[PDB]
Amino acid sequence: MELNNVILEKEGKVAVVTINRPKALNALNSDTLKEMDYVIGEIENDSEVLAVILTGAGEKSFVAGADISEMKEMNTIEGRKFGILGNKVFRRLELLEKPVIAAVNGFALGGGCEIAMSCDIRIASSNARFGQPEVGLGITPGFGGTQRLSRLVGMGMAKQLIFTAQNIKADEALRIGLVNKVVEPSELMNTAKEIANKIVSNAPVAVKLSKQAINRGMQCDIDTALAFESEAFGECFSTEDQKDAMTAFIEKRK
Amino acid sequence: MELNNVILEKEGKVAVVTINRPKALNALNSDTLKEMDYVIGEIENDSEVLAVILTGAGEKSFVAGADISEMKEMNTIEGRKFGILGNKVFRRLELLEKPVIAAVNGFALGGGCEIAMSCDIRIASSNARFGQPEVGLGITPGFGGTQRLSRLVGMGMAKQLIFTAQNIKADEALRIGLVNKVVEPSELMNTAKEIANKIVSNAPVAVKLSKQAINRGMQCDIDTALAFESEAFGECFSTEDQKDAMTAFIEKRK
Amino acid sequence: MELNNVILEKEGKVAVVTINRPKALNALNSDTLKEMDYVIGEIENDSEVLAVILTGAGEKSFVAGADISEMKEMNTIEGRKFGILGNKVFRRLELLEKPVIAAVNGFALGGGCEIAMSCDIRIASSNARFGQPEVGLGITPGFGGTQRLSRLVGMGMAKQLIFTAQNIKADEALRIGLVNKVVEPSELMNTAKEIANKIVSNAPVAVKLSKQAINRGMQCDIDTALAFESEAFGECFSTEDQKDAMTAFIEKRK
Amino acid sequence: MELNNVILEKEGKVAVVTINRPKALNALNSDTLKEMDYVIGEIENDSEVLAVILTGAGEKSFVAGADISEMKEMNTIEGRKFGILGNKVFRRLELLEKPVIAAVNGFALGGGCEIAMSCDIRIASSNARFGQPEVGLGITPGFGGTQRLSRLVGMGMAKQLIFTAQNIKADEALRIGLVNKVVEPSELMNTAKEIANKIVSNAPVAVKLSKQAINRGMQCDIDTALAFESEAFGECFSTEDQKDAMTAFIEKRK
Amino acid sequence: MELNNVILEKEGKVAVVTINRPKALNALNSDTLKEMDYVIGEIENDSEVLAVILTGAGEKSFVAGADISEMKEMNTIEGRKFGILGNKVFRRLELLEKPVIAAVNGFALGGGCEIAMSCDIRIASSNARFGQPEVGLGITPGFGGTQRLSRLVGMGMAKQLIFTAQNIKADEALRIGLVNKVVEPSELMNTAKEIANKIVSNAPVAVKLSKQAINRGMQCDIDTALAFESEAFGECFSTEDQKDAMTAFIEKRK
Amino acid sequence: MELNNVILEKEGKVAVVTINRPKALNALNSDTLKEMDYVIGEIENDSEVLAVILTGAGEKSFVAGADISEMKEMNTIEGRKFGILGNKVFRRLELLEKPVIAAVNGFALGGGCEIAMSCDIRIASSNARFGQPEVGLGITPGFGGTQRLSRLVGMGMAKQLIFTAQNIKADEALRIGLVNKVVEPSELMNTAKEIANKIVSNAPVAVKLSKQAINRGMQCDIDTALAFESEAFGECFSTEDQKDAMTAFIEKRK
């Protein structure tokens, strides 16, 4: 598959996915969604990639939105399918068995907010903006926004942001817990690489399985969630990395 | 019904609902609950109401608890029933297809905290306090408190509050996410109206369906939640507002 | 059973449980978990005990992890069993029908973070640290970490903490809601005891039933949750406490 | 409220609700749905009614369907509301705190199948037919059918009946567990009255609370469901009927 | 502990547990529940035991109810506690990591129905009867009845059985899936033992992990359920049994 | 892709998919799974396919297990992965917006039982058998068996089958609801086509949305489920087929 709107780069144990539609401020569309699905595949096909960073081209936009020309003419049944497909790709991102960090370098609006929310971790530049303008365009959020925002920052804030369609600055995104950290633009990528390298310095199956345990156990009652964990915890004791690391830990007396 | 404890008004497309019992610091009682039921009903039927502000008369109080005289003589089967009827009113408010803003202007305690939590959005004046004193009275929270506080502020704070029965102030309410914002007493209704108007300026089917999606999807696993979203998203494409707002936006975007 | 990792004391109506392995930094091993279960069962039968405070001993540690010697040679099926047994002990603490306050007096890592997350209310001293080292050792959290953290601090932060395995100070911990308060070492137990003491002054059946409604209601959808509450609320009307606190309250306030 | 299309009769401890649009084979419509909501109220307002029987007028139809003239012109947003309202009334029926038995005397198609499925218990005459024709009319079931049928007879059969829109006879309804018993037309009402009188010879709060425990606990995980039961079980020991009946049971030695 | 309501025997790799209160019709009282919990814990630690058969003694009764003398004077809070303790015993049986077969040899009412529903597999003798008398005594089921029956036989039938309190014969019981088989008295234990024996010939880790996946997966949504399975499936690949059964199977079948 | 183990055909608007490996009794293997993935994909894209029949070549077999040679050498982390990939294919089939009919014409064991259960509707020839032998091979069911059988036939039968590893015949499959119907071997495809054609004769958006509602609503509490229905119901009123089928029906009804 050819790659017009997205850049995959690999080096060491981390991949960087860069949305790159510099004219339309990195907005999503049919094609850019297909390209993202494809790269998610590449990434899951490679077991030497242990952590991902998703970012936007340039200094102004992470992902501005989705293309409205594409959406304006759709009927009920088409829009529904268009919702299912974007959700398919973002859900795939969320479940991807490597950690994905969203390096939110500017505008994250609409589908851009939604795709950032689909990552494991969000950090922002100080210039970053977050919002869901969809309801001013006569629609709901369409790529999960009605679900991941409340789960991430609580019903109170989610509802306000979604019903008003008003943006918030980086500092406020931090106050409500939508991002984990805020830094200066010139520090964004270094900070994501440092978090990514800490993650990748850890044991991959444990990170892999911990991600699954959090993602899945969060969907259900606490007793079945906790059982889920012990099953995954068991699996870890079948690996080299488990014995080696617990061993070298006990090289503590030296 | 002629209302004695509740004032219902319409400014623009926003309903303003005010609990007013100056003898009792706007405390709930049966009568007040039945009046509130009635006005939620009126607001349901009124296609000219697109958003709601819920508030309390006066400067001291939002809603300060609930009439204890009505409750003292109840047996187990009567208390049960009383908890069910109150919860019903509040659930009904929670689910109202118009968004609801609690403008918390004073004491919000017990039932008062509970009715506020049953709104979509809570904003507060700096003198406001929130608490659940029920456990000092020999009872649990009975109008959804054991369920809604937890969900809105987490298990740690909720358990602290319900178990100690101690009030918090607005700055703390804000810190733990119980409210989205805190402002001076004389800025409260203005900020509420500014929120309400921005909501009302948006596509109403979209707002209505975003609220449903949020309310309902939050109850279930993410996969079914995301699927609910797409059915609601699709319904929006049956509307003029969507066709019109998008057309407008593409043209104006230039 | 006779105890040499865990002290248990009863001060009027509150029990203080202190994990005491000073040289091991109060770390958890099988004997410790076993004794914990015993003391929990002991507190279960003592109706003079209406609240619990859990802390560690000395001034360096709450609980610093779990014994890696017991773990290093475990295999998949034994790993699993370990996980289940720990979780079974911690889950019993979480459900315990008296409120339990973790006074986190210092290091709280891995299993120690997990035990603290298994209490009702967390409170910390400004020296405390929190973390989940597990993935550095080629394992996932094994005593609930993958489930409780994300539930308490949201997915963004839980995922960052578990994938990176880096620690945070008590101030970060309060910011993300992991704890409800930070005080200085010298204030910790007084703070815990004054929280415990307020709890103990309130009606005991009401606090009990509240704990249950919050735990059980939090697992399911809001409608069946709300209905759970009313059944519990009803039960409070069978007690004398309800009759006397509400008779007192009327006359008292006048 | 006036009652054109529905008959409420009370005698002893049982109410009989009779759908009675003999011309349109007892089909539902806006008005008949409002009338059903009203009678549900009357019934819940009367504590001497301990069991309900829902049936259709005449010997041919239980409830044939809903009126299609009413539905044909609706748009997306109207149909959605029309779905919510019918579901509101049937859900109210399902939760009504007295047992409701559906005496299915003939055709139960569409909304008729759906309203029968909303009762606690179904019994049929041998001439009864069951089905969901909606998908041949260009719609889904609209009054719960997509939910109660699978829950009642399993996904396999529900899907077949719903995707094909083909009817099944009484004997087959019995084989898949959609009804509990099949009898001759001249025996239908006697059999429903006998089941109703057995129910009503039992202790009303226990039946009341058992209904709630089944309805609610079925919605959630088994641990929170079982906790739900014990709360309700507790409530029972606060009643006369509990002590009297256990006492008179132990008059067993006579 | 030494046992005088419950016999426990070990036949190669299967344990037979027999409730033995011949004169009381094997009824459950607190001492019996207590001993059951003890024997369950005893079977828990015995890894030579890979399956369990539960039955009653003599030819009239499986378990006929629970002792109403212990219950008659209980109040709301004590009722509740009783319910929780029974359920806690039965839930431990349900989750027990060896399969358990109820050989229902006769009467199985109230608590006795409930204990049988708490095993993995039910099998009955043609004389057996099933039922839930509780509502005749002014109580709901107290040891899981309100939850397990509807889960096993569907809502239609569970509701009829609990609201009416009437019993059914073993043939009705098989029809509705309450039991998997009916045999004559003389065949019962052979049938159980041959089921137990097949189970015991199969790989033990696989049966264990299957029991867990079925119990825990059944509580949540299909996607997190499916993911639970794969984690367990993975664990099977850590065992020698998997390696040897699949090496055998190839060569064997040729 | 050129297919070696799967035959894909179109008769009318129905796709017929046939698993065909005469050397191996149509047993699954990796290759066969990838081919099945591919054809589910083709069927997704084909707007001319409105229903699917899944079957096996020959007279002995539907799908008889899965290639054990591929599995024997796997470690824990590889087995996990293998279970995930298989489940994915099957989930994808389960969720396909065209209904799927398993025409079970012979042995359906292990993977074979599992793929059949992942269809919407199961019909069987009288010589058919169903079973899960995985536990004799040292493994759990790994393609959703621990989850789907339970849901389709109940916990009692599912646990019996998975634990014993014993096959049942078609008459028993029918009795426990695993299949909707059983017919002679030479009537099987005819009955399947008759089902498929009746489905296909219906309004396709309605069928498609009924399937979603059923799949998704079954995962959650009834209240949110019913709400999902109404969003889907409403979408149908955006379609001609609804307008047309209703008009037609009102006119023809006369």
Curated annotation (Swiss-Prot), chains A, B, C, D, E, F:
UniProt keyword annotation of Lipid metabolism present: yes
Protein name as it appears in the record: Short-chain-enoyl-CoA hydratase
Source organism of the structure: Clostridium acetobutylicum (strain ATCC 824 / DSM 792 / JCM 1419 / IAM 19013 / LMG 5710 / NBRC 13948 / NRRL B-527 / VKM B-1787 / 2291 / W)
Annotated pathway: Lipid metabolism; butanoate metabolism
Higher taxonomy: Bacteria, Bacillati, Bacillota, Clostridia, Eubacteriales
Domain of life assignment: Bacteria
Biological role stated in the UniProt entry: Catalyzes the reversible hydration of crotonyl-CoA. Can also use hexenoyl-CoA but not higher analogs.
Gene3D superfamilies: 2-enoyl-CoA Hydratase, Chain A, domain 1 (3.90.226.10), Lyase 2-enoyl-coa Hydratase, Chain A, domain 2 (1.10.12.10)
Gene Ontology MF terms in the entry: lyase activity
GO biological process: butyrate metabolic process; fatty acid beta-oxidation
Pfam families in alphabetical order: ECH_1
Catalytic reaction(s) noted: a short-chain (3S)-3-hydroxyacyl-CoA = a short-chain (2E)-enoyl-CoA + H2O
